[PDB]
Amino acid sequence: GKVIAGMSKIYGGTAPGNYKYIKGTSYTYYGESDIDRLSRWDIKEEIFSFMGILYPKLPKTPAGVRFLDDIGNEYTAIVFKTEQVQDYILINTDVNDETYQGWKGTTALNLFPVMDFERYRTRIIEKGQMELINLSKAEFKIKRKADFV
Amino acid sequence: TIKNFTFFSPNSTEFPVGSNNDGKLYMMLTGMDYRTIRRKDWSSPLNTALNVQYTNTSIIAGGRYFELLNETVALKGDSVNYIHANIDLTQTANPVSLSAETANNSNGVDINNGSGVLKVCFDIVTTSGTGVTSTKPIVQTSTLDSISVNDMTVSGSIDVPVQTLTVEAGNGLQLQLTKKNNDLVIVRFFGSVSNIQKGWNMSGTWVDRPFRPAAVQSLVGHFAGRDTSFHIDINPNGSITWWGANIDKTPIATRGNGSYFIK
Amino acid sequence: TIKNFTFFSPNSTEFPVGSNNDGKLYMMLTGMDYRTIRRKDWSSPLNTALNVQYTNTSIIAGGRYFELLNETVALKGDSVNYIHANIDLTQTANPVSLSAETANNSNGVDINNGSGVLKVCFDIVTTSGTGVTSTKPIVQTSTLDSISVNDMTVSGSIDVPVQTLTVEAGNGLQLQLTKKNNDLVIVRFFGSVSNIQKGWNMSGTWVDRPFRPAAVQSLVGHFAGRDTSFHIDINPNGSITWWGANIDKTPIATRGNGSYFIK
Amino acid sequence: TIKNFTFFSPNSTEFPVGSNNDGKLYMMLTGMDYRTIRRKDWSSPLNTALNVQYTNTSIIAGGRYFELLNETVALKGDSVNYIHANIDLTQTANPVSLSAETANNSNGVDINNGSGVLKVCFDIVTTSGTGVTSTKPIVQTSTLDSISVNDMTVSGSIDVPVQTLTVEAGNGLQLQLTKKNNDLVIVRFFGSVSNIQKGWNMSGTWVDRPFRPAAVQSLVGHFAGRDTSFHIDINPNGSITWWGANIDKTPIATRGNGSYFIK
């Protein structure tokens, strides 16, 4: 948010800086140092399946997405622990043709046995936010059902 | 409702923080109530006859900060004055006022949440007919729940919880136990023991659970008026096993002090 | 680079203070980490059926101050409810929310330096099938480096460092030493002594440097099942001198507790 | 004159709070002087050759908050470098500057009330010819008046007030008393007692008032090189009463340690 004189927390004007406690206008913080760290992958309505292209960072560290509910707790997580850095993990939650393949170059690797079976509790994603575990970049395609349209 | 404060407002109106809101925040940070203060003298206050001028003294009363810059306080002749900080929020121009009172009239009124005038003593001034005789500042209380600390230095003293116990071991033996901080216990020997053998358990009452040690504690005592000694094994189950020489029908006075750790 | 905050901005733009910077500042002033809180009920919370209404409670979590003003949390029946403050900075309009959970799910997430939701438990509310039976607050931890204090009162207990050492002193004598606060030592005698004379150094292991006293310490012991006693001297060099009577080939069981200060 | 700060400004001009006013306020809350700091390494600093980079370290020096974000400071080869935080308010563009020095050159300049440059050491970097060998940070002293705590955990040690006294009891007895926290006292027996009867008082000096216990403490001793023992009664009035065997003209060496509580 933009910095405003009298409204923001700053010691300005006549030396050695002055910030006033007013009623309603008082002092409101401008923003946060390095606000570029905050990124929310927002989930507003219940989603069923998705086709994400996961770009992993570190090898041998569980890489994959986890899902947070409205209170900041985890219900489901698709997490894989690979031996080498995959160029991208392709995950599809579609019931009919599930795909969990780690691509490296032109080679496609099946990631099903390497996956955490206990963390992956449900396919149905609820209202909250998605967190990226050991990922540099992410590209998602969300499919959400509607009974009558 | 949840009123958020230490959070940025993008439209610069969302989360405004007031004097009372920060006042309550500061009180929690230092661990103070409306009955105690945070006071620091940057320059010693001058004493001119029956008057006390605070050259440069900063005070945090009820989480509200204020500086006293060459502020003189009138004193009562030949009396023990109590200097109070009076905060009346209704006085928008001058909320803080000072007063020298007969007795400590600290009210502890919650000003940050409710209405009223907050009175709190910070300095005690003892005076004579002419001028100031002696000055004593009010202790700055820091109420805390738990402390994780590397090192500590105490200039006064520490008040640890004390527990007393008087168990009649039997055969004529009396023990006076004093447990401090649930660890160190000093056993005081009393009475006169009779009809007991070596390695035999003592007939009377057993040691209570809060005073029982983790391992068997061998505590040495002495027979009054003699050069003969004894020792009793306080086992973890509370049982007191005699380990001195075999004593007949004649009772001999037993006295002594023995220290042991429970933990 | 150096980022300055508590400094004057000549053109009102140089040093803006962010909510994360104040968060870190406040955490440092009070000595709190992301796994604790500062909490104050200015007025008592009210229990109505399976609900707790926080009437006026202030909380500091991750250095962020907020107020619960008539904020009701719904509870699970016949359960131990762990009340959490949840901070999500991405939820710009409502960054703080409360939850009643089945376990203490405090996560210690650094919200002032990185991304994520901070969850911190502050209250434990136990219910029956109809309402609240008991409430217990979570401890407010103060993590400090070094304290210089005048007086302190402890209602619970102080946990100080403890070191133990078993010494095979020689001639069958065994010492079990327990040192607390690196100062107070309680020596427990074990084993059985034979073939020693008064004034003679015991033939075994010397006391390790961390248990050595600054001055010679005479510790009284007792012979199990006898009227006789002895004493040993723990010398500042770690050696142990026998000061009982001369002992012949037959071993005599040695017991008793003796205390000394290292400092 | 009274300068109010944590208060509402009706016309938005009444109570302006400055950097020095908040600076003094923050100092009083944490309990710090101009000679100590509040430092926290959010991310461990990196050591590359004869240089130390502070990745993310927040420091509160003289109540002034600042962050070191990847700020590298040059070091001296094979030397003990004392890293200082230098605050100069006249340097309005960049008030905080870092410096690696030969010795701890902390000045304790009152920057909030007066003028000058504040210097304060926070880190001690020991180096070699190539790089860094070891790093030891400066202690964070939290100066407090009174503490009202429930529980405590110490990783180092607590310094309590220690008082020592040497009483020449009489008949050939010497008592070395060591009082810690004005409560626990360990008495050491010295000298050679001669010409005394059982139940009779001591001829020489009496125990001083600060070392006098609340009740009569029976302290057990031992005769050097013998299998005979003794015990003395230190009454609350300061009097010492012998309770061992009757001693004839020949003096026998008396040694031993006996502990008791005053309160």
Tab-separated table of C-alpha atoms in Angstrom, chain D:
chain	number	residue	atom	x	y	z
D	1	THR	CA	6.436	20.269	32.036
D	2	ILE	CA	4.784	16.933	31.054
D	3	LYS	CA	5.262	15.521	27.506
D	4	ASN	CA	2.483	12.980	26.725
D	5	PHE	CA	2.942	10.412	23.903
D	6	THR	CA	0.712	7.266	23.928
D	7	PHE	CA	-2.443	9.469	23.724
D	8	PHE	CA	-5.060	10.718	21.231
D	9	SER	CA	-4.484	14.020	19.384
D	10	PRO	CA	-7.935	15.719	18.917
D	11	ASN	CA	-6.808	18.283	16.283
D	12	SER	CA	-4.118	15.790	14.995
D	13	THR	CA	-1.284	18.064	16.337
D	14	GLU	CA	-1.483	17.526	20.161
D	15	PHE	CA	0.755	14.473	20.831
D	16	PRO	CA	3.364	13.782	18.095
D	17	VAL	CA	5.608	10.792	18.936
D	18	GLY	CA	9.236	10.910	17.727
D	19	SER	CA	11.901	8.250	16.969
D	20	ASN	CA	13.746	9.011	20.259
D	21	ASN	CA	10.457	8.980	22.292
D	22	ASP	CA	9.553	5.514	20.900
D	23	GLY	CA	13.248	4.519	21.213
D	24	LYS	CA	13.219	5.248	24.973
D	25	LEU	CA	9.771	3.535	25.232
D	26	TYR	CA	11.063	0.278	23.600
D	27	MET	CA	14.154	0.213	25.904
D	28	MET	CA	12.041	0.365	29.111
D	29	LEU	CA	9.714	-2.460	27.893
D	30	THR	CA	12.532	-4.995	27.278
D	31	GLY	CA	14.723	-3.611	30.108
D	32	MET	CA	17.891	-2.559	28.237
D	33	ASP	CA	20.577	0.178	28.455
D	34	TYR	CA	22.815	1.772	25.748
D	35	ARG	CA	25.470	-0.947	26.456
D	36	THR	CA	23.338	-4.009	25.433
D	37	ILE	CA	21.384	-5.119	22.295
D	38	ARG	CA	18.402	-7.241	21.195
D	39	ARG	CA	19.662	-9.455	18.339
D	40	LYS	CA	18.021	-12.349	16.446
D	41	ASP	CA	19.401	-14.352	13.498
D	42	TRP	CA	16.283	-15.346	11.466
D	43	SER	CA	18.658	-17.003	8.945
D	44	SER	CA	22.202	-18.100	9.968
D	45	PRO	CA	24.936	-15.630	8.808
D	46	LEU	CA	27.298	-16.855	6.048
D	47	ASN	CA	31.113	-16.758	6.403
D	48	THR	CA	33.041	-16.423	3.092
D	49	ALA	CA	36.868	-15.943	3.454
D	50	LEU	CA	37.789	-13.046	5.866
D	51	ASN	CA	34.207	-11.623	5.614
D	52	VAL	CA	30.900	-12.236	7.488
D	53	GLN	CA	27.539	-11.692	5.712
D	54	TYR	CA	24.439	-11.234	7.911
D	55	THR	CA	21.742	-12.873	5.698
D	56	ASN	CA	18.797	-11.737	7.921
D	57	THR	CA	19.557	-10.385	11.405
D	58	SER	CA	17.379	-7.821	13.223
D	59	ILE	CA	19.036	-5.629	15.930
D	60	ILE	CA	17.510	-3.235	18.530
D	61	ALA	CA	20.367	-0.964	19.699
D	62	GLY	CA	19.422	1.982	21.946
D	63	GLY	CA	15.747	1.154	21.361
D	64	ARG	CA	16.246	1.668	17.596
D	65	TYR	CA	15.126	-1.223	15.316
D	66	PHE	CA	17.067	-2.102	12.129
D	67	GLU	CA	17.472	-5.150	9.818
D	68	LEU	CA	20.726	-6.454	8.288
D	69	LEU	CA	19.745	-7.983	4.923
D	70	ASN	CA	22.792	-9.674	3.276
D	71	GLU	CA	25.104	-6.992	4.794
D	72	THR	CA	28.739	-8.221	4.558
D	73	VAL	CA	31.464	-6.857	6.894
D	74	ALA	CA	35.255	-7.259	6.227
D	75	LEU	CA	37.417	-8.967	8.904
D	76	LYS	CA	41.043	-8.888	10.202
D	77	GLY	CA	43.234	-11.975	9.579
D	78	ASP	CA	44.125	-14.208	12.599
D	79	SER	CA	42.335	-11.773	14.967
D	80	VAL	CA	39.361	-11.612	17.375
D	81	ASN	CA	36.983	-9.185	15.570
D	82	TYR	CA	34.412	-7.267	17.666
D	83	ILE	CA	31.459	-6.405	15.348
D	84	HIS	CA	29.812	-3.091	16.344
D	85	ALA	CA	26.492	-1.427	15.442
D	86	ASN	CA	27.203	2.317	15.001
D	87	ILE	CA	24.299	4.812	15.202
D	88	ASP	CA	24.820	8.455	14.155
D	89	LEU	CA	21.530	10.428	14.012
D	90	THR	CA	23.231	13.350	12.142
D	91	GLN	CA	23.809	10.955	9.178
D	92	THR	CA	20.112	11.257	8.197
D	93	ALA	CA	20.457	9.187	4.961
D	94	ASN	CA	22.121	6.147	6.657
D	95	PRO	CA	22.221	6.317	10.510
D	96	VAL	CA	23.261	2.671	11.105
D	97	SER	CA	26.722	1.454	10.001
D	98	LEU	CA	28.633	-1.745	10.894
D	99	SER	CA	32.323	-2.113	11.859
D	100	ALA	CA	34.641	-5.016	12.760
D	101	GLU	CA	37.035	-3.777	15.484
D	102	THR	CA	40.140	-4.832	17.496
D	103	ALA	CA	38.387	-4.604	20.930
D	104	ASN	CA	34.889	-4.171	22.510
D	105	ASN	CA	34.588	-0.372	22.049
D	106	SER	CA	30.979	-0.062	23.393
D	107	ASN	CA	30.437	3.559	24.566
D	108	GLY	CA	26.828	3.625	25.805
D	109	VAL	CA	26.095	7.126	24.379
D	110	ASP	CA	22.554	8.371	25.191
D	111	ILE	CA	21.436	9.088	21.572
D	112	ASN	CA	17.721	9.409	22.515
D	113	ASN	CA	18.195	12.221	25.113
D	114	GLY	CA	21.500	13.777	23.984
D	115	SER	CA	23.937	13.921	21.035
D	116	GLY	CA	26.833	11.676	19.919
D	117	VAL	CA	27.537	8.369	18.132
D	118	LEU	CA	26.367	5.144	19.836
D	119	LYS	CA	28.707	2.128	19.576
D	120	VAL	CA	27.656	-1.349	20.797
D	121	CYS	CA	29.186	-4.816	20.151
D	122	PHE	CA	26.797	-7.687	19.288
D	123	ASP	CA	29.031	-10.389	17.719
D	124	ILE	CA	32.602	-11.672	18.372
D	125	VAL	CA	34.159	-13.251	15.244
D	126	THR	CA	37.414	-15.233	15.758
D	127	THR	CA	39.334	-15.640	12.458
D	128	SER	CA	42.349	-17.478	10.934
D	129	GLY	CA	44.605	-16.642	7.947
D	130	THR	CA	42.044	-17.958	5.420
D	131	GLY	CA	38.582	-17.616	7.022
D	132	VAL	CA	36.480	-17.721	10.231
D	133	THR	CA	37.242	-20.247	13.045
D	134	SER	CA	34.522	-19.496	15.684
D	135	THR	CA	31.662	-17.011	16.361
D	136	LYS	CA	30.366	-16.009	19.844
D	137	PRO	CA	27.501	-13.437	20.180
D	138	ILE	CA	27.350	-10.726	22.912
D	139	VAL	CA	24.993	-11.394	25.883
D	140	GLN	CA	21.528	-9.685	25.935
D	141	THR	CA	21.157	-8.332	29.500
D	142	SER	CA	17.503	-7.802	30.531
D	143	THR	CA	17.706	-5.490	33.588
D	144	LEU	CA	14.553	-5.908	35.748
D	145	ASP	CA	13.297	-4.722	39.198
D	146	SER	CA	10.802	-7.421	40.366
D	147	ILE	CA	9.681	-10.744	38.787
D	148	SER	CA	6.366	-12.584	39.468
D	149	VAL	CA	6.895	-15.899	37.598
D	150	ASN	CA	5.275	-19.389	37.805
D	151	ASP	CA	7.971	-21.648	36.218
D	152	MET	CA	11.623	-21.327	35.039
D	153	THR	CA	14.224	-23.371	33.061
D	154	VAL	CA	17.937	-22.371	33.275
D	155	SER	CA	20.642	-23.655	30.839
D	156	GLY	CA	23.594	-21.991	32.642
D	157	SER	CA	23.608	-20.680	36.248
D	158	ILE	CA	21.805	-18.344	38.737
D	159	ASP	CA	23.933	-15.944	40.845
D	160	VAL	CA	22.502	-15.620	44.396
D	161	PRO	CA	23.772	-13.298	47.238
D	162	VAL	CA	26.590	-15.122	49.113
D	163	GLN	CA	27.583	-14.130	52.709
D	164	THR	CA	30.513	-15.690	54.665
D	165	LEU	CA	31.288	-15.725	58.430
D	166	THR	CA	33.993	-17.345	60.628
D	167	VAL	CA	32.847	-17.818	64.265
D	168	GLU	CA	35.354	-18.804	66.992
D	169	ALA	CA	32.771	-20.843	68.996
D	170	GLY	CA	35.207	-21.473	71.869
D	171	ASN	CA	36.882	-24.415	73.703
D	172	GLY	CA	38.878	-24.903	70.445
D	173	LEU	CA	36.084	-24.823	67.809
D	174	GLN	CA	35.960	-22.824	64.536
D	175	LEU	CA	32.838	-22.583	62.305
D	176	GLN	CA	33.032	-21.541	58.611
D	177	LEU	CA	29.498	-20.491	57.536
D	178	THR	CA	28.514	-19.924	53.868
D	179	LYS	CA	25.019	-18.367	53.381
D	180	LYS	CA	23.487	-18.282	49.862
D	181	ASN	CA	20.194	-16.447	48.948
D	182	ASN	CA	19.898	-15.567	52.727
D	183	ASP	CA	18.469	-19.108	53.315
D	184	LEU	CA	20.743	-22.206	52.830
D	185	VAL	CA	23.908	-22.279	55.011
D	186	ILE	CA	26.693	-24.932	54.940
D	187	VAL	CA	28.839	-24.870	58.129
D	188	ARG	CA	32.402	-26.308	58.083
D	189	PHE	CA	34.033	-27.602	61.323
D	190	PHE	CA	37.655	-26.557	62.121
D	191	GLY	CA	40.108	-26.586	65.056
D	192	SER	CA	40.583	-28.936	68.043
D	193	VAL	CA	38.009	-28.914	70.913
D	194	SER	CA	39.230	-29.351	74.546
D	195	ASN	CA	37.635	-29.102	78.070
D	196	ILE	CA	33.829	-29.309	77.450
D	197	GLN	CA	30.793	-31.216	78.897
D	198	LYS	CA	27.511	-32.487	77.312
D	199	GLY	CA	24.633	-29.964	77.240
D	200	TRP	CA	27.011	-27.083	78.153
D	201	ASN	CA	27.243	-23.789	76.197
D	202	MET	CA	30.318	-22.619	74.178
D	203	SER	CA	32.862	-20.289	75.911
D	204	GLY	CA	33.834	-18.135	72.893
D	205	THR	CA	32.007	-15.989	70.279
D	206	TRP	CA	28.245	-16.265	69.479
D	207	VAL	CA	26.610	-16.587	65.992
D	208	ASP	CA	25.820	-13.179	64.341
D	209	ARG	CA	22.171	-12.071	63.700
D	210	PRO	CA	22.112	-12.581	59.826
D	211	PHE	CA	23.338	-16.214	60.276
D	212	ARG	CA	20.937	-17.069	63.188
D	213	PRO	CA	18.303	-19.724	62.221
D	214	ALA	CA	14.540	-19.597	63.049
D	215	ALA	CA	14.736	-22.854	65.099
D	216	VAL	CA	17.514	-24.846	66.888
D	217	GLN	CA	19.544	-26.686	64.189
D	218	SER	CA	21.419	-29.857	65.253
D	219	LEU	CA	24.597	-29.982	63.085
D	220	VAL	CA	26.611	-33.265	63.080
D	221	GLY	CA	30.447	-33.251	63.011
D	222	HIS	CA	33.322	-35.802	63.244
D	223	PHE	CA	36.667	-36.240	65.100
D	224	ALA	CA	39.561	-36.572	62.562
D	225	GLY	CA	41.274	-39.994	62.457
D	226	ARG	CA	38.694	-41.574	64.807
D	227	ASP	CA	35.391	-43.531	64.617
D	228	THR	CA	33.749	-41.135	67.161
D	229	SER	CA	31.425	-38.230	66.193
D	230	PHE	CA	29.711	-35.134	67.729
D	231	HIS	CA	26.815	-32.665	67.174
D	232	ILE	CA	26.280	-28.959	68.029
D	233	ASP	CA	23.013	-27.053	68.633
D	234	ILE	CA	22.899	-23.551	67.069
D	235	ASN	CA	19.972	-21.983	69.000
D	236	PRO	CA	17.966	-19.023	67.471
D	237	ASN	CA	19.524	-16.519	69.966
D	238	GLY	CA	23.016	-17.202	68.499
D	239	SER	CA	24.197	-19.532	71.317
D	240	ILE	CA	26.066	-22.764	70.462
D	241	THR	CA	25.368	-25.779	72.745
D	242	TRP	CA	27.740	-28.806	72.750
D	243	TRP	CA	25.988	-32.213	72.575
D	244	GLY	CA	28.833	-34.714	72.010
D	245	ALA	CA	31.009	-36.725	74.435
D	246	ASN	CA	32.723	-34.902	77.366
D	247	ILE	CA	36.160	-33.730	76.263
D	248	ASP	CA	39.199	-33.695	78.573
D	249	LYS	CA	42.340	-31.491	78.462
D	250	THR	CA	43.653	-33.191	75.268
D	251	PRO	CA	42.377	-31.382	72.116
D	252	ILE	CA	40.925	-33.553	69.312
D	253	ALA	CA	40.643	-32.202	65.718
D	254	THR	CA	37.041	-31.476	64.625
D	255	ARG	CA	36.042	-31.626	60.920
D	256	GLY	CA	32.777	-31.964	58.945
D	257	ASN	CA	29.995	-30.248	56.924
D	258	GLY	CA	26.464	-29.488	58.166
D	259	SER	CA	23.677	-27.744	56.197
D	260	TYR	CA	20.545	-25.904	57.494
D	261	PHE	CA	17.785	-23.424	56.398
D	262	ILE	CA	17.337	-19.979	58.049
D	263	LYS	CA	13.748	-19.213	56.848
